[PDB]
Paper text:
CNNM/CorB proteins are a broadly conserved family of integral membrane proteins with close to 90,000 protein sequences known. Structurally, CNNM/CorB proteins are defined by a conserved core consisting of a transmembrane domain (TMD) and a cytosolic cystathionine-β-synthase (CBS)-pair domain. Here, we determine the crystal structure of an archaeal CorB ortholog in two distinct conformations (apo and Mg2+-ATP-bound).
In agreement with the AUC results, the loss of ATP binding disrupted the dimerization of the CBS-pair domain, which then makes contact with the helix-turn-helix motif from TMD. The two conformations are interchangeable by a 90° rotation of both protomers.
Author numbering:
A (entry chain B): 1 to 45, 50 to 148, 169 to 324
B (entry chain A): 2 to 151, 164 to 324
Write the structure that this text describes.
Amino acid sequence: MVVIDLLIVEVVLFIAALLFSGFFSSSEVALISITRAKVHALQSQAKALDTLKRSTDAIQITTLIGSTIANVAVASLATAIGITLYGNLGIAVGLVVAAVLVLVFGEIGPKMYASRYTEELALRVSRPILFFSKLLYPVLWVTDEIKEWIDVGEEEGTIEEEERDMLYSVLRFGDTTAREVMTPRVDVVMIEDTATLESALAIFNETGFSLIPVYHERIDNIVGLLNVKDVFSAVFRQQTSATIRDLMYEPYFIPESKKIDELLKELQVKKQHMAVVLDEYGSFAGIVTVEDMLEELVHH
Amino acid sequence: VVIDLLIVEVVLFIAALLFSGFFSSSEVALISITRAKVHALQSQGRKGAKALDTLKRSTDAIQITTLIGSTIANVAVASLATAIGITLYGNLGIAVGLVVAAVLVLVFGEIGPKMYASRYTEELALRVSRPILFFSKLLYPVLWVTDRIEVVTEEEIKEWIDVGEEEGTIEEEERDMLYSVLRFGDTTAREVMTPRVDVVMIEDTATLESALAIFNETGFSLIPVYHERIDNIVGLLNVKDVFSAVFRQQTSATIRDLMYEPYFIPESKKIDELLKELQVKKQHMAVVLDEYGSFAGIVTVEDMLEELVHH
């Protein structure tokens, strides 16, 4: 080695470390700032961005470690370059200059400019941040009664006794879970992802339903939902190669602990109306229709 | 000497790592404390708090003051870890100083101190309120520089439902309950709050004998309390407690002694959340503030259920 050689190796490592911090700091801003619905439309038109968005906090962990390690090195290198140039006072010089640059070009700067060009930057840093996350994945693994309250309201003038019954259901609506209102697996209708469109139409008429699940060689592995309008329109327009895998649309899975009040709001946002349910092990449990949720309100 | 300067850097290293914990832990706790909770602290005779409000008015300043601090502090941790490191392990010490500083700053300077903020967001805020406020005053030039540098369609529900009615996934009979339940969740407190102007309150300095006059004149059972201005709500006063007092007061307790801290909420609190949150607290009224921390109205459980029942 040599003094000049090492210093030039350090300055390029110092220059590269600063540029790496900007990529990590600006990536969080662009990653999180993206609107959820806009991400789905782009995905339909990315796939890694949707993967990282599944765990919003995961993006924060990966980026945090990236920016922190990058900025530590900027100081580490500049203060080695600092002392080999100005002596013990070089740690002060290195601390001053490395501190100024990490803010200007390493954290403050890139965060602001990420909102201006948030579109292109978000997609460009989707894949690499997803690669770093897989590298930083092991560390991430380490991170990992009622009548009393109401009767009082009426006495305080808060509630009117006429509006008591309706209140009761609104409370039982939030407390109710998907496991209670759903339909059990044993009684659910199903069609495999490898079946002729003619057979689905039979199922659609024998049972009469419009959305029948699509399992994948196993009752536990649901891979899509099949609308009857998609099948009836497929056999009519003779498509020599028209399998269920094409017509099925990816479902929206939920846990058994999901409250039905949230489910109903979300389903009408995503233009869907049936939801698939999974258990703690990731198997298949049932299906909740908007009708199933409101059945308790219909029977009072 | 070599040994005495290595002793100066090892303590400054420990200190620099503590600052990054101060800036990092304070950043999490301060932003997460809801502005409705900050309003409660000021009227509570709480330590600091009055400073905690000054910072909450600017959401950028809190992010700049914590970023600038934790950055300079983390650069200092590394600058000192390589200074100590390079003297201990030659030119390989620049590498050890990068590893030790980067693994400690994350664990004990950024990630770890964030954990204490989540569990203790309130007390940490009042303990770090004033400090971050004089850091902002001296970081003023950069802050000015950074400031200079800086769909619920009615038809969608109808079509979406009728599409469901066609699928059989929804029923036509159950349309009303569905159209209403959607409006219930998407309704804010503002839309159901009795406006500030029409609210009847009692100043905390008033007499219990005067409170009774208000309870009878209006007929309400619970009337808010405003410490100095109508913009301010410091508590709610139940008539049942005022009557029991005047009957056997003896000590003549004032409003501040008999009132109770309200449930402050923002104008945006979806009533769907407000109902479950209020009935869990066994409380049925909720004061409603605004972004600037003023007073804007109140919400009772009937208000949230009125439009739904009458519809």
